[PDB]
């Protein structure tokens, strides 16, 4: 995944991805991907 | 090979959204089934039951 930093916390996802991730626009402000929120 | 391809592009088309279709089929299958809770409960320490 190239042009989405990853951060360590995670959140609910609204865009799947795959394996456990997903990708989301959120804070100025980039898209992000993070592990998906239970 | 590629050159003949553009009579059956069509074809190609409809194959390649199908296969979409069922990955994503397969995909939201899981969570009409598992995904019922918006919580998740944690187990009590307690074994007494
Ligand atoms: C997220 O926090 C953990 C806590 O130890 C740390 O190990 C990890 O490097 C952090 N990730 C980022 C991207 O800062």
């Known amino acids: ?38 | 090979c590629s050159n003949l391809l553009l009579q059956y592009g069509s074809f190609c088309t409809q194959l390649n959204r199908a296969l979409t279709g069922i990955a994503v089929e397969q995909d939201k299958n899981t969570q009409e089934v598992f995904a019922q809770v918006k919580q998740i409960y944690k187990t009590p320490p307690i074994k007494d039951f």
């Open chain 1, 1 to 38: 995944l190239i042009g989405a930093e990853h951060v360590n916390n995670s959140y609910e996802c609204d865009i799947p991805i795959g394996a456990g991730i997903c990708a989301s626009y959120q804070t100025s402000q980039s898209i992000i991907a993070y592990t998906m929120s239970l």
